[PDB]
C-alpha cells in the first residue's frame, strides 16, 4: 500500500468523481484509479 505522507491543509482536496461513487470532493473511502489527482494544484509531470 502507497504511503502520501504529509500534505499542508493549505491544499484543497480535489473534487473530481469517477464510477459513480460521490461526484464532489475526494471522500475517505471513495475509489481511485490509476491517474486520478488526489489534490486540487498542479501535478508533477514526471510523476504523471
Known amino acids: 500500500e502507497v504511503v502520501y505522507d504529509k500534505i499542508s491543509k493549505r491544499?484543497?482536496?480535489?473534487?473530481?468523481?469517477?464510477?459513480?461513487?460521490s461526484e464532489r470532493v475526494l471522500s475517505d473511502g471513495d475509489h481511485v484509479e490509476v491517474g486520478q489527482q488526489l489534490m486540487e494544484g498542479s501535478a508533477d509531470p514526471h510523476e504523471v
Do not use: A
Request: charged content about 45%; glycine content about 10%; proline content about 0%.
Open 11 to 21: 491544499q484543497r482536496l480535489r473534487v473530481f468523481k469517477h464510477e459513480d461513487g
